Amino acid sequence: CDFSEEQTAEFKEAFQLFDRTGDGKILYSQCGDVMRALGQNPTNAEVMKVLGNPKSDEMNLKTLNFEQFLPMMQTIAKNKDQGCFEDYVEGLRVFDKEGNGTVMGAEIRHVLVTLGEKMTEEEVEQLVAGHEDSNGCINYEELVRMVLSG
Template sequence: MADSPFTPDQIEDFKEAFGLFDRVGDSMVAYNQVADIMRALGQNPQNKEVNEILGNPSADDMANKRLKFDEFLPMLVKADKLLKGTLDDYVEGLRVFDKEGNGTVMGTELRIVLGTLGEKMTEAEIDGLLQGQEDENGSINYEAFVKHILSV
């Protein structure tokens, strides 16, 4: 693809990963696997965005329609171009939980948010994410936390 943001090596890796989702052996995957494949390849689209990229398929199409890698790659390019949050967006989102206005949030509160809102995280994922982030009072400097997350 001429306008692809990906290198030929990345595309080969993507093709290999795509093949791992082929459960039938016909070099195709089901529509309902596209979001998982995109996430496995480092994208983070919302389910709503994946449905739009797929052309808003019916539930029947999601379960039964299949696509080849050559059809999938332009969809991955679209997912890559989706608006991603900036440092300021994430910091602003966490500022809501900064009751004291001192640049910190309680680790326990952040754990609840990560485990219950949006794309819910598991306890193990949350533990890994917050490891070493809490101070002796159980507080987390959320701007430093967001910078850490975005650098990983």
């Protein structure tokens, strides 16, 4: 195992802190949220490798103990690295129509909801701090530079 004793202890603390429905075992879907709370950015396909319940899983019957959780955390951690802010803002430079280093708030918030995985306006609005006031053209530098702290 690549994780330290301190990291394992912290993960075990987190595992039992982000509880509970009633039982001390974490839910199958909620496990992914724990991994994301631990700052990881895997796709839902990483969970689909284990493939607990092929159908819609409201029931979450595939509950996990710590010994089942930790390997998933490891395969997530060893999955991939993540690119620098330039790789992000290149996307914005492609989406932009002004050619000035900013982007229209109304357009970008919609684009980031429609393309790829789906998100709510409640989720997306919380990501921006330089809000769409009198000026429509939000500087996307603030967005990326803030969120990448996580």
